[PDB]
Write an enzyme that holds these catalytic residues in place. Sequence first.
Site, PDB file in Angstrom:
ATOM      1  CG  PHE A 289     -58.399 -32.960 -13.525  1.00 48.65           C
ATOM      2  CD1 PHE A 289     -57.757 -33.934 -14.266  1.00 48.65           C
ATOM      3  CD2 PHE A 289     -58.730 -33.236 -12.209  1.00 48.65           C
ATOM      4  CE1 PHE A 289     -57.429 -35.150 -13.698  1.00 48.65           C
ATOM      5  CE2 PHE A 289     -58.408 -34.453 -11.641  1.00 48.65           C
ATOM      6  CZ  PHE A 289     -57.754 -35.409 -12.384  1.00 48.65           C
TER       7      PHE A 289
ATOM      8  CB  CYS B 212     -58.941 -32.609 -18.331  1.00 47.60           C
ATOM      9  SG  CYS B 212     -57.702 -33.862 -18.357  1.00 47.60           S
TER      10      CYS B 212
ATOM     11  CB  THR C 279     -51.163 -35.344 -16.672  1.00 52.28           C
ATOM     12  OG1 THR C 279     -51.763 -36.101 -17.734  1.00 52.28           O
ATOM     13  CG2 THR C 279     -50.819 -33.946 -17.167  1.00 52.28           C
TER      14      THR C 279
HETATM   15  C1  MNH Z   1     -53.310 -35.944 -14.073  1.00 52.43           C
HETATM   16  C2  MNH Z   1     -54.129 -35.823 -15.100  1.00 52.43           C
HETATM   17  C3  MNH Z   1     -54.388 -34.606 -15.908  1.00 52.43           C
HETATM   18  C4  MNH Z   1     -54.188 -33.261 -15.579  1.00 52.43           C
HETATM   19  C5  MNH Z   1     -53.661 -32.618 -14.322  1.00 52.43           C
HETATM   20  C6  MNH Z   1     -54.614 -32.652 -16.732  1.00 52.43           C
HETATM   21  C7  MNH Z   1     -54.630 -31.192 -16.963  1.00 52.43           C
HETATM   22  C8  MNH Z   1     -55.305 -30.443 -18.033  1.00 52.43           C
HETATM   23  C9  MNH Z   1     -55.483 -29.067 -18.015  1.00 52.43           C
HETATM   24  C10 MNH Z   1     -55.049 -28.127 -16.921  1.00 52.43           C
HETATM   25  C11 MNH Z   1     -56.149 -28.741 -19.192  1.00 52.43           C
HETATM   26  C12 MNH Z   1     -56.569 -27.354 -19.635  1.00 52.43           C
HETATM   27  C13 MNH Z   1     -55.334 -26.601 -20.134  1.00 52.43           C
HETATM   28  C14 MNH Z   1     -55.637 -25.135 -20.345  1.00 52.43           C
HETATM   29  O1  MNH Z   1     -54.752 -24.374 -20.712  1.00 52.43           O
HETATM   30  O2  MNH Z   1     -56.868 -24.672 -20.129  1.00 52.43           O
HETATM   31  C15 MNH Z   1     -56.336 -29.943 -19.871  1.00 52.43           C
HETATM   32  C16 MNH Z   1     -57.007 -30.071 -21.175  1.00 52.43           C
HETATM   33  C17 MNH Z   1     -56.968 -31.314 -21.968  1.00 52.43           C
HETATM   34  N1  MNH Z   1     -56.535 -32.519 -21.560  1.00 52.43           N
HETATM   35 MN1  MNH Z   1     -55.783 -32.971 -19.646  1.00 52.43          MN
HETATM   36  N2  MNH Z   1     -55.762 -35.019 -20.152  1.00 52.43           N
HETATM   37  C18 MNH Z   1     -55.527 -36.028 -19.311  1.00 52.43           C
HETATM   38  C19 MNH Z   1     -55.229 -35.915 -17.877  1.00 52.43           C
HETATM   39  C20 MNH Z   1     -54.900 -34.646 -17.214  1.00 52.43           C
HETATM   40  N3  MNH Z   1     -55.029 -33.416 -17.733  1.00 52.43           N
HETATM   41  C21 MNH Z   1     -55.601 -37.237 -19.986  1.00 52.43           C
HETATM   42  C22 MNH Z   1     -55.391 -38.596 -19.371  1.00 52.43           C
HETATM   43  C23 MNH Z   1     -55.902 -36.927 -21.306  1.00 52.43           C
HETATM   44  C24 MNH Z   1     -56.090 -37.857 -22.450  1.00 52.43           C
HETATM   45  C25 MNH Z   1     -56.715 -39.021 -22.445  1.00 52.43           C
HETATM   46  C26 MNH Z   1     -55.991 -35.544 -21.361  1.00 52.43           C
HETATM   47  C27 MNH Z   1     -56.305 -34.808 -22.593  1.00 52.43           C
HETATM   48  C28 MNH Z   1     -56.657 -33.380 -22.581  1.00 52.43           C
HETATM   49  C29 MNH Z   1     -57.185 -32.708 -23.667  1.00 52.43           C
HETATM   50  C30 MNH Z   1     -57.484 -33.321 -25.008  1.00 52.43           C
HETATM   51  C31 MNH Z   1     -57.390 -31.396 -23.291  1.00 52.43           C
HETATM   52  C32 MNH Z   1     -57.949 -30.293 -24.155  1.00 52.43           C
HETATM   53  C33 MNH Z   1     -59.341 -29.875 -23.702  1.00 52.43           C
HETATM   54  C34 MNH Z   1     -59.809 -28.762 -24.607  1.00 52.43           C
HETATM   55  O3  MNH Z   1     -59.055 -27.838 -24.864  1.00 52.43           O
HETATM   56  O4  MNH Z   1     -61.032 -28.791 -25.132  1.00 52.43           O
HETATM   57  N4  MNH Z   1     -55.819 -30.939 -19.149  1.00 52.43           N
END
Ligand code: MNH
Length: 452
Positions: A390, A397, A265
């Site tokens: 996000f 996230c 991402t």
């Molecule tokens: C660009 C940056 C970026 C985007 C667009 C991004 C997008 C998302 C989205 C959309 C979701 C929810 C998915 C859903 O089906 O509801 C989500 C959940 C999540 N994300 Mn990320 N995420 C990151 C950076 C991003 N995340 C980074 C960096 C990490 C780790 C360090 C990370 C770790 C997660 C985790 C862990 C979840 C789960 C949250 C949960 O379910 O409680 N993230």
Amino acid sequence: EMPQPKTFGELKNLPLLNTDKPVQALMKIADELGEIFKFEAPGRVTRYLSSQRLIKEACDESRFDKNLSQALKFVRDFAGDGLFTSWTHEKNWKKAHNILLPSFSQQAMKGYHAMMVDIAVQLVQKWERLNADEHIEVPEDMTRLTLDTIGLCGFNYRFNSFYRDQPHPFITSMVRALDEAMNKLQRANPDDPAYDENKRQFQEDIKVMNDLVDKIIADRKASGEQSDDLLTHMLNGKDPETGEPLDDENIRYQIITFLIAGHETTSGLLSFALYFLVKNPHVLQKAAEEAARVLVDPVPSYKQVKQLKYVGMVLNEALRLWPTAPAFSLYAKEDTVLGGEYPLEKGDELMVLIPQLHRDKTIWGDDVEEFRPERFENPSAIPQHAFKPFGNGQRACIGQQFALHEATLVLGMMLKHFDFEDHTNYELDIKETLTLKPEGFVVKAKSKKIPL
Ligand code: MNH
């Protein structure tokens, strides 16, 4: 009733998903069909949402909860009980949420930033040490940076991914597994001789990822520990409610999810942001000024990232036009009517087109395709739930501030130390591995002769 795309008989809409770019095909479909459109495949039904007024109801914590997409279900095999792939009515999700959330905070971000610099320095030194004739593959080198950043900061392991000509084995295997997830969704018939070959491969790739995690726990096991880190908060971290640490078997799943979701991402975001900065000169000039004024010392400080305002605006706008996480799915927690026009039985699945949501002309003006960071000069003015790149609510996230912090810090140093030239007037081509990244995006970056 609810519009839907063309169904070829038994397989209904499912044959449409075969394309290299499923999310973009769905965006095209949404442009014509309207606010919402039904999407039924054999054995699975999901309604794609594109209008903001439906998104705001779908996002309500007391109205709809997170549902695992068909591809995310297949993702579980390597990721599993990690929050991104864990359920909301799941035990491990709640435990991990409560105990890994404190590992992301202002104090935490301070813990991670000093080590982030190191990896960004490796990137800057690589691009500074390139010869004049050479060019830079932005998405590739961005994945290279993001892996090492997340590794060194949140797991005390240096992937050393910059010292490799080709992508890291982890990158190759991860991308290939995501390949099967997507490509088996689009698949009509589950069993066939040929797929066995595929199946073989996907046992192989996964193992590499597994093997790689084995280093982090083993390395830290043998080397010195007790240095506050994500991996520490996983080993020694304890649940406030139940007084329980994480399951070791579940700790490894956490490591998988974090490694995967921390680079793809962020790296896609950096590539897209650099691309949009290249297509518009003025929007670069402003940010090249910002990085210079805000970051004086050779090494950025934890405070200096927050002082950067225009960098975050650029990142948010680039994330608006092409959100690197293309979609999220949600199921209804009780019988409701969406929009007052569409009745849905409880448990029905709705996917949300984030990039199509950002392209809604009513909210973002009638020049949505226009990329201007100035939209985010007053981010308070943006309507509620119109901009959710996000995610939404509790499920969104935990490390999004880490995403922004690494991306802003890196991009600030990139604009500080370099001059970007586009030699091909690159035709935008988006490769999808469940995540959006430019493909074939190559630029050159002249040195600005700045220390360290
Ligand atoms: C660009 C940056 C970026 C985007 C667009 C991004 C997008 C998302 C989205 C959309 C979701 C929810 C998915 C859903 O089906 O509801 C989500 C959940 C999540 N994300 Mn990320 N995420 C990151 C950076 C991003 N995340 C980074 C960096 C990490 C780790 C360090 C990370 C770790 C997660 C985790 C862990 C979840 C789960 C949250 C949960 O379910 O409680 N993230």
